[PDB]
Design a protein around this ligand. Structure first.
Ligand code: ICS
Ligand code: ICS
Ligand code: CLF
Lengths: 522, 477, 522, 476
């Protein structure tokens, strides 16, 4: 039933007694459900050290992964170039998912095409798909460039992207001069971040490999910036803002901030902003190239050093205090610009906030996950705040990376109780937050189901989620946030201390029970 | 507005295409007249997508895993292949269920074999057998496993049927192999068919020789309601108020035992014809169970459906039918009285999957709105046949519409409201056109039944009449 | 007792069984406490309409006010001028409170002096205190200006500030040319915002009254901006940012953003930034003067119009979409500068966020309080979001202001269930959130005790607090936020929709009970 | 040290005008072991010099904020304009058990919100109407106090007559308190005024009522305002020792407890400054002895428990040693963990009237050294007690000015400063770890054995925090 002036959605509609009785009759009559006492017994078992040991012995099964597949990152990389259409050679179901995935995170349109290879092409290849796809794409959506990657069907059957594109030009389907960079992006290798590296290296090669002879390192006095797989608008903006403040000439290679944030002014803009073709062509003339997320830009680095002859600085992701300091100092050395008073002051305001909030942050225990560069930066900053990152999970991390994080932990007293996990998933993490309970989780939206599980054991066992990472689907507009630089550290600091204080207010809100500690001032 | 207007519109839009694409897309675009009643005389459907035109379609894995099998709550469904497909489709569809997730229900979890390159080179059949054992150790209350094949499985020559047969016998467990690789077919549609056949071959006959179920004359099954936002619950409640006993729901909030019980019912009630007509035809041929199509969108269709269903039974059911209709009459009348004045005359364009592009027209008309354009991602001609009886004269029809086409149609027709999917929502909001998601209900609903209609009306009103839509043009522009 | 490896603070230490038993015996032995059933009965009664009617019949008693006294606003105003020391002539206990109040909200030092009048001065006045006070302050803390206000003791005994200061100069305690603007700031008149108005007008007249012969309206081609009582750093910064983006010359008169945010770099800076004396001296030569919070700048308005001969525009506070639009268009007209593409895009990005989030905001019911301009801007923006501001409370509001708000409400269907209250306090508001329960409260930290009260009736009756306003003491660094302009509208929108979604997640987190609606995507 | 410290003092005082300099010189001294009469080296409890940014509050703070405000089942009216009660609403963590708004009212702000009409015509009629409204809306209150703000005495109001007339009409305890902020020189006189009001209007209520069943082990905690639970973590030890704590003045205190206090056998005074007045009175009138004690740190707490137990019989002295043995392993573990991390570090304190000396023992139990201390509003008898606690040649400052405190810190360079909210953010920006020693920085309790563990945790987390290494940009 409904009352017209107070209409109920599914919650709380289905709590009405007639729906409750209906659902009980459905269960008892036809679901043949395990009895509740057995459900309770198994749930408790899933929270034990015994279950955890079986859980970590898994070899073939993955449950609730914390990674996606390569083409997702090739699409995001391609979106960062001016009037560029991402184009995934293979089966169309993939592109629907890529677009919807980013749609839900950014709450924006996401343009991407497929060439719809089917059972036919699985045998004789997708050459005809490429010819008609490119011609169709260019005519219909008028990109200035089409950046081509592959779905796993195209990788398995072995389509030769280079040949197919050259034959499309040879046979007149697209102009010889029309730019069609490409990269192979097999989903069964690496993860989404690997696709970003592969796509970017492909675009860099397309515009510079055969034109190197007139290039001179440093002749344009700029510094190239490669951001990597990045899903916070604020992170593109803070980098451009800090370099502009320093007076540093720079080129941000793959810059999607505009196309991921177009205004609602009465017209749809399929393309907006982005790195220009001339910027890619001219990049070898830069003084150097800085990789903001080096642990998934290894292929790009080889090409930048091997072909452009740049000496890429050894720099961690600029997250937290020390690593932003190191970023700015290195940029200052390369460019000859001094760090200006404005950035020095911003640094000191971050430190001020640390002194103001250290008493509530000290000793707080965290479980966290994400991509490797983001995770290690979050770890570094947590140590700088006097927090303990006890469970560090990076599904798509590698041994060399885990060694580097383990060395960061060893250099601080706040790493004494921390462990780094690679190749583990969020069902592994669920066990850890039960057996070795932290105070909070820092992670993406998939963590909300872990918080749900911990609460079911008991309010005192609940581990609240703090949403930082990708994807965030169940809150609005956090993709506008910042995690890099002093600005990003300030945002993270605020989110953490206030998540702590929010939870303490909840636990002390009980009248005449716990509200003796419900302080007005904290 | 006029036919000639629309026909010129179609020709204008198609001028941009290369020759081959132009000729193909023209066959999937039509302006319906009440004189032509055979969809096969005016529009083509269920053909391949043209490359590079940004179709809105998904794949057979989405239709099998995401639509039909995923919602079955007490089974564990393996996304067998690389890690992508299961991640993008984890909890994206609001097929609601009651359960204890991770112990006895598993719908919002993502199980996967996370293929690496070694699995491409040596095959994944050994990994799948090991994965099945790990599942049994760590999820002992699961009541069956399904194997949802992703693109590489069939391409590398794996034999998941052999694995499911061996492991199922070894473990005395229902293990369903499903060959829904994304390169099969042309859309989600073939995934439905493949999934229906997998139910038939590996699940549906388990109790063929069983006589322990206590039947009644009023046993029915809800076929093709995936309980989006609770849609099936707000339907089930009405059927049982009418005196029927709903033995099963395929597959929203559905259990495997419900599925196995369905051959014992008296009537199959089919909501989504597209995804479930295959298994419904099988159950009539094999078990003699008749099936009928119904429609619970809006009070007009819901009342019509209750009476048609009640007419399949005796006078006692027909009496309770009118008691239900009378109980809910003041409620939905109050909804129209409040919201129809606020929506009347407004024009709607729809683009959805395989059912709702026609099934929701009645509910829009119950609020005085007009559907001036509609289309499907993956419908067949029998769907379009049914669409011509619902749509008004001279309205625009589009099959497997391209992104460019949809934009250009909207620019010219200038509807007051668009109902479509997540890949479309943010395009048209920026154009200043109110948008409602008509797959996910924009995280609202249910929309089925009398209780769903209240929410439907509230939702169309809140978005169409929202103050944000008059603020897109800066006062100085 | 304590476990050394897991030390407990008051919460949860006193939940240990031995502390619980000790407290129960203290209660039963010596407190002569009312029976718990009697407490419950009275609590239930305080939530009823019957209680509300007695509550609203109060004439003499005020309970949990939502205002402070004038000198607090005079201190804040004075802090906004370069190297200026706020100086409150009167009793020293007031200054301790003013500093501590601002200390806790900004988490920054707050410099302010008293001249420590005692009982003796009630007979012979505070002249000598002023003479030694000004000399001691100037020598010790080396301000360039001392801005003098009064405590209520000085007001009652009737000290003539003007004379006392003139005699301090005549008798040689400070140099004749040393700037000592003053204002009488009686706490029994108006509220803290009145103190801001009085102080500012006092400073404006000190620097311009006797020098008007020299002035020509518009000759410096700038627009004066008077911000009023403002406790968000981002609100000073956003105004300056927007005007700079427009290429508009401006003078922000009273600008404390630097002194309330100095870096922690090893030295304490008593003063930083601020409006210069030259800017005040030159202010009459501006094109015009814009008042960002006109409803507590009435006296200032009369002086800028009566003496500077500026035609102050009729502008609302630039909060929300419509009123930021109106602000920018009027600044364009005055300055002759067009609204640039950057601000037009930012506007459309705010509108895009509105379209993205409108379905969770629509119909949400709010209780809210604060100062008059802030409250009416919050009301305006809420209506623009499709939200219903059902209980609008402004303790220090007046009839003319309430009429303006009632007219805004009457112009929108989302004002149909709203009531504006003036002269009522948070004990009045407590009753309203019980008898006509809203979904959320928007207010300062004193609202946490209302939320606690509502939870005690029942979780289904709890009204969560969303902290926007002044003072915020129980969260860290929200004083860095923004509420004006498109930037501030974006921040408020994000906070509101995410507070809604946080609460929905809490209510749907119960496994197998309400988590059918615990959606990953919202 | 001594020579450098006296030179420091004179160098700092050169900034002042002549008159301020001559005065402030009298309030700054260097501890000399052979000088035990503080009246021979420092003066105190004098008016503050105008314009030097004293840290002191007023007599309303000492009465309403400190003594009366914590009494939990009474309603306290901030009688006057709106400011004073708002700034002091729930700023002090005098903790309590109650149902706020129903039977307890500590964190609420009741005020008469004086308007100019109340200045012109007087506030006595408004106060009588206020009392009636309080009675209607808060029926379970067990008494009302009227805390006078500056205007009340200046305009000639007569709150004593209102309290007498309304108290009799309604059969209610209504306490007029003349704690106007222009009285005295600081919070201190507010303490005295408040003590005298308890004496006059509350404490003689059960004078000849003898229905309470006394025992030989009845005591009262006098001068513990339960900051963060300080009084509860003291009470538990006293009752583990076999004593019966009849009353707590006034943290978590009820009016009935206060009224029962003339029936106890011994008054245990923690805060001498604020409650010695009423303690002396109860000794003069009822023959109840009083003693000073100290529950900061294991050494002082053990010493106090033994001294208190010596006032009773062997049964209590036996239970005393039982408590000392129970908690021995717990506080030894705290010392074993935190003393190595704090030993040798030097501390400067500046607080109100007790803690600037009372916490020295706890610091020394962690191997730290208090190199400077001072009080906002202490008297010379406090400074007498301080010289016994402080080390040779340490710096003592009375009613320190903001400028003095900053300049002393820049020269002495302590590792830690313990002071108030108006001081905290100054010294953090100078790169000096700071702990609030009024509010406990929203931590605590710090009293007793359980409080020592938190105190040590807190000093360690701040002193050794990684943020303090980061003040300096690597490029400067
Ligand atoms: S199954 Fe089909 S696309 Fe019939 S694949 Fe699709 S939950 Fe659509 S129009 Mo998403 S044939 Fe259901 C559908 Fe309709 S997922 Fe849902 S809304 S009624
Ligand atoms: S009462 Fe006094 S200033 Fe003895 S007015 Fe003050 S809660 Fe201080 S040094 Mo705040 S004489 Fe208590 C005090 Fe000490 S408020 Fe607290 S910490 S032990
Ligand atoms: S059409 Fe469909 S969704 Fe596409 S892959 Fe094929 S079954 Fe799957 Fe999966 S892993 Fe990633 S997203 Fe693709 S490239 Fe392979």
């Amino acid at each position: 039933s409904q009352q017209v002036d107070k209409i109920k959605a599914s919650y709380p509609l289905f709590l009405d007694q007639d729906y409750k009785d209906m659902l009980a009759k459905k269960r008892d009559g036809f679901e043949e459900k395990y009895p509740q006492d057995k459900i309770d017994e198994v749930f408790q078992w899933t929270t034990t050290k015994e279950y955890q040991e079986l859980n970590f012995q898994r070899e073939a099964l993955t449950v609730n992964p914390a990674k996606a597949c390569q083409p997702l990152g090739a699409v995001l990389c391609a979106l960062g170039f001016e009037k560029t259409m991402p184009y995934v050679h293979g089966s169309q179901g993939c592109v629907a998912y890529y677009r919807s995935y980013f749609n839900r995170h950014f709450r924006e349109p996401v343009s991407c095409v497929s060439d719809s290879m089917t059972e036919d092409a699985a045998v004789f290849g997708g050459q005809q798909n490429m010819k008609d796809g490119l011609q169709n794409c260019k005519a219909t959506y008028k990109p200035d460039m089409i950046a081509v990657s592959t779905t796993c069907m195209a990788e398995v059957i072995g389509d030769d992207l280079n040949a197919f594109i050259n034959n499309s030009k040879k046979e007149g389907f697209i102009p010889d001069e029309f730019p069609v960079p490409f990269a192979h992006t097999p989903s069964f290798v690496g993860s989404h971040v690997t696709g970003w590296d592969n796509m970017f290296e492909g675009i860099a090669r397309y515009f510079t490999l055969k034109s190197m002879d007139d290039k001179v390192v440093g002749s344009n006095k700029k510094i190239n910036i490669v951001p990597g797989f990045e899903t916070y608008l604020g992170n593109f903006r803070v980098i451009k803002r800090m370099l502009s403040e320093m007076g540093v000439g720079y080129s941000l290679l793959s810059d999607p901030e505009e196309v991921l944030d177009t205004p609602a002014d009465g017209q749809f803009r399929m393309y907006a902003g982005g790195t220009t073709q001339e910027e890619m062509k001219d990049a070898p003339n830069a003084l150097n190239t800085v990789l903001l997320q080096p642990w998934h830009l290894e292929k790009t680095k080889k090409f930048v050093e091997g072909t452009w002859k740049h000496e890429v600085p050894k720099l961690n992701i600029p997250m937290g205090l020390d690593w932003t300091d190191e970023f700015l100092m290195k940029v200052s050395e390369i460019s000859g610009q001094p760090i200006p008073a404005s950035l020095t002051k911003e640094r000191g305001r971050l430190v001020d906030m640390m002194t103001d909030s250290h008493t509530w942050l000290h000793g707080k225990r965290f479980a966290l996950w994400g991509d490797p560069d983001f995770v290690m930066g979050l770890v570094k900053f947590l140590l700088e705040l006097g927090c303990e990152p006890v469970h560090i999970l990076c599904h798509n991390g590698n041994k060399r990376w885990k060694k580097a994080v383990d060395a960061i932990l060893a250099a601080s007293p706040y790493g004494k109780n921390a462990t780094v996990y690679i190749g583990k998933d969020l069902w592994h993490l669920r066990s850890l937050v039960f057996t070795d309970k932290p105070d909070f989780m820092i992670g993406n939206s998939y963590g909300k189901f872990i918080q749900r599980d911990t609460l079911h054991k008991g309010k005192e066992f609940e581990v609240p989620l703090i949403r930082i990472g990708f994807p965030i689907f169940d809150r609005h507009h956090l993709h506008r946030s910042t995690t890099l630089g002093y600005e990003g550290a300030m945002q993270i600091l605020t989110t953490l201390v206030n998540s702590i204080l929010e939870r303490l207010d909840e636990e002390t809100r009980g009248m005449q029970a716990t509200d003796y500690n419900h302080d007005l001032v904290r | 507005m006029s036919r000639e207007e629309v026909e010129s519109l179609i020709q204008e839009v198609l001028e941009v295409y290369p020759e081959k694409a132009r000729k193909d897309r023209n066959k999937h675009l039509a302006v319906n007249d009440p004189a032509v009643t055979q969809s096969k005389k005016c529009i083509i459907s269920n053909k391949k997508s043209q490359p590079g035109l940004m179709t809105i379609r998904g794949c057979a894995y989405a239709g099998s895993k995401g639509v039909v099998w995923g919602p079955i709550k007490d089974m564990i469904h393996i996304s067998h292949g690389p890690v992508g497909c299961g991640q993008y489709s984890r909890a994206g569809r609001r097929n609601y269920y009651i359960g204890t997730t991770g112990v006895n229900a598993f719908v919002t979890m993502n199980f996967t074999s996370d293929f690496q390159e070694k699995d491409i080179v040596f095959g994944g059949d050994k990994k799948l057998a090991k994965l099945i054992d790990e599942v049994e150790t760590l999820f002992p209350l699961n009541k069956g496993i399904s194997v949802q094949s992703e693109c590489p499985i069939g391409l590398i020559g794996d034999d998941i049927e052999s694995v499911s047969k061996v492991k199922g016998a070894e473990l005395s467990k229902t293990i369903v192999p499903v060959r829904c690789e994304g390169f099969r077919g042309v859309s989600q549609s073939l995934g439905h068919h493949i999934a229906n056949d997998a139910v038939r071959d590996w699940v549906l006959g388990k109790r063929d020789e069983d006589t322990t179920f206590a039947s009644t004359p009023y046993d029915v099954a809800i076929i093709g309601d995936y309980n989006i936002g609770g849609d099936a619950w707000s339907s089930r409640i009405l059927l049982e108020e009418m005196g029927l006993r709903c033995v099963a729901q395929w597959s929203g909030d559905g259990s495997i035992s419900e599925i196995e019980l369905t051959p014992k019912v008296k009537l199959n009630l089919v909501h989504c014809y597209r995804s479930m007509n295959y298994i419904s035809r099988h159950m009539e041929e094999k078990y003699g169970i008749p099936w009928m199509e119904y429609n619970f969108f809006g009070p007009t269709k819901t009342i019509e459906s209750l009476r048609a269903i009640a007419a399949k039974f005796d006078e006692s059911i027909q009496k309770k039918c009118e008691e239900v209709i009378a109980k809910y009459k003041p409620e939905w009348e109050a909804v129209v009285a409040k919201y129809r004045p606020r929506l009347e005359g407004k024009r709607v364009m729809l683009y959805i999957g395989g059912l709702r592009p026609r099934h929701v027209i009645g509910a829009y008309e119950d609020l005085g709105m007009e559907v001036v354009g509609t289309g499907y991602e993956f419908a067949h001609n029998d769907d379009y046949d049914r669409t011509m009886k619902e749509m008004g004269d001279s309205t625009l029809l589009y099959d497997d519409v391209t992104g460019y086409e949809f934009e250009e149609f909207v620019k010219r027709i200038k509807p007051d409201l668009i109902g479509s999917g997540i890949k479309e929502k943010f395009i048209f909001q920026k154009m200043g056109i109110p948008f409602r998601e008509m797959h996910s209900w924009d995280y609202s609903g249910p929309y089925h039944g009398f209780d769903g209609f209240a929410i439907f009306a509230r939702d169309m009103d809140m978005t169409l009449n929202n103050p944000c839509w008059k603020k897109l043009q800066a006062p100085w522009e």
